Amino acid sequence: MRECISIHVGQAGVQIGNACWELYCLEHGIQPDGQMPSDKTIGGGDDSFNTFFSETGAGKHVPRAVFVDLEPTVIDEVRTGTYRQLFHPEQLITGKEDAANNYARGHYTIGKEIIDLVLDRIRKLADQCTGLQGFLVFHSFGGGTGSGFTSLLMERLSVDYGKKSKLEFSIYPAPQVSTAVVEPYNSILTTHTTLEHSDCAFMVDNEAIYDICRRNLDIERPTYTNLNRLISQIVSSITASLRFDGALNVDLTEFQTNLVPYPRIHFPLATYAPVISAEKAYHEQLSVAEITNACFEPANQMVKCDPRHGKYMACCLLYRGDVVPKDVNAAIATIKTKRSIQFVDWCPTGFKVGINYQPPTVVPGGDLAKVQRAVCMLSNTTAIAEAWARLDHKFDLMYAKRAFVHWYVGEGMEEGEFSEAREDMAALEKDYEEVGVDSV
Amino acid sequence: NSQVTVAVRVRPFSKREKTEKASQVVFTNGEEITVEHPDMKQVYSFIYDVSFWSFDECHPGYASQTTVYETLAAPLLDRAFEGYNTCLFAYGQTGSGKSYTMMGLNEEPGIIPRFCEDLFAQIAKKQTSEVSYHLEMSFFEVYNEKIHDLLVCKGENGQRKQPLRAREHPVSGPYVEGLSMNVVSSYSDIQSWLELGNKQRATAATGMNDKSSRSHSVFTLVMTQTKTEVVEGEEHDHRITSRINLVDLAGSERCSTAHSSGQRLKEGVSINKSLLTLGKVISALSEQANGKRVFIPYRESTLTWLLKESLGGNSKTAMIATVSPAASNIEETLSTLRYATQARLIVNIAKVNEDMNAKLIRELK
Amino acid sequence: MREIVHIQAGQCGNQIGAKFWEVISDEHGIDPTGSYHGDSDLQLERINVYYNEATGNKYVPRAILVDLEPGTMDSVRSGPFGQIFRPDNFVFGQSGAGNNWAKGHYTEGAELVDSVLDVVRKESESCDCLQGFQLTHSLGGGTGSGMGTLLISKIREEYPDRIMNTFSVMPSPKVSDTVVEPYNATLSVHQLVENTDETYCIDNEALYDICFRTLKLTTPTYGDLNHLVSATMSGVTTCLRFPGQLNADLRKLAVNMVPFPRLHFFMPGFAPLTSRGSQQYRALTVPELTQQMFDSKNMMAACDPRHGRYLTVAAIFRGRMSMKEVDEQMLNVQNKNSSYFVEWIPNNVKTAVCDIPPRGLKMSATFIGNSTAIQELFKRISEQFTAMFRRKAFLHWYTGEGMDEMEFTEAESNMNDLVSEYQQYQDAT
């Protein structure tokens, strides 16, 4: 059976893990105590689909996930919370301090003494798999553990495993909003190191979801328990092809090909069109044509980046529910007739389609509505350079005076590792420039 | 009024590298220096105020030891005898040739011996019945932001690294409390003291070498000129002093590739920090010389605080960064180059010089 | 796994500490018998930070009181919460400092600190993982400044990786309490600058105005003023004890607040404070906290940020809150008041939001600021200093105890250098 490993790192990933497994457990029919009475009443089945949940003899289904951190104060909401009887007690959480918004502290200093234990429990879950498809890493630029440890771990996995797809779901640092004065340093050092190892790193910006939650869902005072259910839907729309039956099923290796032309431009953006409240769930048709055009609407992009300042190199669409292909080809034709959507000349196709039959569910206590169709658009745009440059300029301003550097050197880091990283960040911005230029 | 003279020296291959046919990655175009990766992906360009291309004995402008001395160090003696303080910093990773340049062999001397002997010669020439000169010397080290002396005998103990303190005399600026100072009359005495001290300088067999320096060494010469002038009486006591400082810095070294725990890690951290503060002070000094209003953070590190009176003011600073041309040392090379740079790194990409023979484009034109 | 050693030096620390343990015990539900009478289970999950355990499920604080005048230490034992402290940690001597920095640093402190450090090593090695230290003392006197900074220098060499968070009552501009505050303070700053990571400057004049202008108190005593400092000391170390959405330890503040090593002096604050009557008129929302926090009158430092620029600030929130409402508001403060912020730091603010509010409140907030307005303290002391040292006004009570004219000048220059180190960023750029 086809399987995927879900690695969760730092506070930003763990709190998304709780939101993803709240959703996976609901769709298949699992209670928080690991049980699935459906097979007790039916007489067995693969409904507890083995891609994400492994099975024991007592009927308990354990998730294929690992929940790393350096703070105890985050995991201990899990070991004491609703889902304590689901996860293996091996959660790999360090009885020491955090990284204190420091790459050098998460990469080397207090990233070692832990990494070997993390890399074994990953090995144990992989030896239990009869054909592994890839990894799914959840972290956030801005911290030490989501920057450092994720750059330490992805290096070791490129050695031992090598050929398996290693995907990232990352919280891009926003331009105006931010919870740390040293997000840029921890972000530009990360891309220097992951860019050679990861294969496709989907990016989201917390600021865009804050706006998406205001315009559409009408939530003026959101929390992180509202952003992350909406992120949990992106991951499910990706991993649905491995779990449920469908007409066109897009595995992991197919995202890695259609969306990544050259090895260094694997930074696409995600979104989800039918963000509709219960009240506005009526008064809407919610057709493929209405849902599909909205994925290109800049307001509904989950990264603050106007696509109209750039060009699309590749775009993958993942439909769900009562979706008929003829309605999709009509849509993709309607998008190529427009002129605010300018593609590259070297990708006249541009598009990919995936269709499933299992509609999305509704996590109770939430805000999203019961819609019968859904879309997840994964786009590779040249616009995202404007975000790279905005971060680099923040880096060059406060690095010239060597502000906040001694906290990095004090954990083991050379001054030239900034500059080297800076050069790496100044290249990539030329590659996104060159590839977007029209050929002769 | 001041200005930092930055010089970069690219050594030649060694016999071992010539045997292994280690490739070349550092090139020259007159004054500019470049690094072209073996992967043919990026071309980094550096400019420095002075370059010393000791790669091939045949090329015009091959930097001899005398050329290096007469270009970088000797004007410091002119300013010293003029009555102004001087500092020469030496930086370079092990295997670059940081000692060959400074101290040198028995046959091909370096900056230290040429400097000291020329000093003695100029003194012997200027010595008369009216003017006299007096030379004192000291030799201390810095280790984990603590001071130690290099010219005492280790007592009968498991260790006698007796630390000392720094203090700010309101007039003479900062100084080191309890440091021994000795008088000198010849390079024999200077060489004897230095050869004693460099056995006590902290060194350990890291991964990169059997003997890599883990302390910042400071070698100070205080030169006092006693002259006389008519005061309607006994001409007496017109006194001038000048301080020469020769600093040997330690190498940076990252601790993420060079796995290293414990005392080695603490040493590397302190080295990295001191070098960072040194770079900040140097850039602040450059901006001050170019005329901006600048605050120089002398106090964020012991070396800067002790050398305050010999970098700022009407004082003359020089830095010599040593690099290797081989490809295996390329990370260290790029790091040292970036560190020695003061204005900006230049970057391009080019693979278009190979014009298939004899500049094909000419006949195309 | 993140434990703190509390140290209390002098008459200003030992009376704050007495209130500090009278505010944490009431949070974690501990009574003065050391026993637990709480309601939730969160109060005990991270009790290992400040308190240790004992036989009968009793909890003994990790406090180390130090002094040279027993009169203060004996006042604590007789107080309401005195009977929980470990009696072997009541370290004292005799022959008080006499408001002389020398006596508390050079003569009587040296003959006492070795007994103090034994208690520290005895507590530090009983901890699984040590975050840092927490000293509550006062400049202007002898014990807190002398014996405090002597103890800092020793712990920093012996425990160099760990944090030394300091809460310090600075001298006031108008109304002194000791005639030789400039001497006893300038020497203390010479030690704190080198040997600290984060120092919280408190000034009693600012606390009297907060008590009179906002709290509308007519007869405020020192126990009330300290009820404002005990609040900030807790808000800082909240996200170690209680869980939240975005957590922040002490180190996570220092990295985001100390851009250069020497500029670790902070202006604290606390929200929301109000009168016993005016609480029926003020809705507690996230915006109302943020305005009160950035208000010059609500800062405990006796300076005014509006004569300078914020280099970097911090807002440790406590309660159920919308993260958008926090991030929007901290953004709005910068884009409106950009002149009071630094251009070469793109965002001068961070955030931390905990989910367990205080004993009787829906939401609270702590504010920590690093501003160029803090130079007016050191420039003011540097003026009082040189006017006195130039004619040697009170100097013979120090030289007779093992000092010289040289150490006084070192204290002036490091302080006057730090002042200029702040002004460079205060100006146009």
Ligand SMILES: CC(=O)O[C@H]1C(=O)[C@@]2(C)[C@H]([C@H](OC(=O)c3ccccc3)[C@]3(O)C[C@H](OC(=O)[C@H](O)[C@@H](NC(=O)c4ccccc4)c4ccccc4)C(C)=C1C3(C)C)[C@]1(OC(C)=O)CO[C@@H]1C[C@@H]2O
């Ligand atoms: C029942 C009730 O709502 O009365 C309030 C009250 O009227 C006000 C005035 C309280 C009251 O504040 C004061 O009276 C006061 C006087 C001098 C100095 C400081 C405070 C109160 O004491 C404050 C006290 O709040 C707390 O108890 C916090 O938990 C506070 N408690 C203690 O520290 C404490 C001190 C001694 C003994 C036991 C507990 C706290 C603050 C920070 C961290 C932990 C705890 C409460 C609810 C009130 C009173 C009692 C009137 C407020 O207190 C604070 C910290 O702001 C002022 O605004 C809050 C809430 C109210 O406005």
Ligand SMILES: Nc1nc2c(ncn2[C@@H]2O[C@H](COP(=O)(O)OP(=O)(O)OP(=O)(O)O)[C@@H](O)[C@H]2O)c(=O)[nH]1
């Ligand atoms: N989308 C989302 N982002 C979060 C959440 N919690 C924290 N973050 C993000 O995390 C970033 C700050 O860095 P952290 O993720 O806390 O750093 P870390 O990976 O946890 O490493 P440490 O901070 O040392 O524990 C900010 O950009 C936050 O937006 C969350 O629940 N959802």
Ligand SMILES: Nc1ncnc2c1ncn2[C@@H]1O[C@H](COP(=O)(O)OP(=O)(O)NP(=O)(O)O)[C@@H](O)[C@H]1O
């Ligand atoms: N300019 C030069 N021209 C020719 N040969 C040189 C030059 N500089 C250095 N060398 C050679 O390279 C060696 C480097 O110096 P040596 O002290 O032997 O090793 P080292 O690694 O440079 N010591 P260190 O730099 O302190 O780590 C010299 O001994 C010479 O043999």
Ligand SMILES: Nc1nc2c(ncn2[C@@H]2O[C@H](COP(=O)(O)OP(=O)(O)O)[C@@H](O)[C@H]2O)c(=O)[nH]1
């Ligand atoms: N805030 C506050 N300050 C105090 C208290 N007691 C003393 N002080 C301050 O302490 C200073 C005097 O220092 P002192 O404590 O006598 O020094 P010590 O004798 O060495 O401990 C004055 O500035 C007082 O304002 C108190 O209970 N609260």
Ligand SMILES: [Mg+2]
């Ligand atoms: Mg954390």
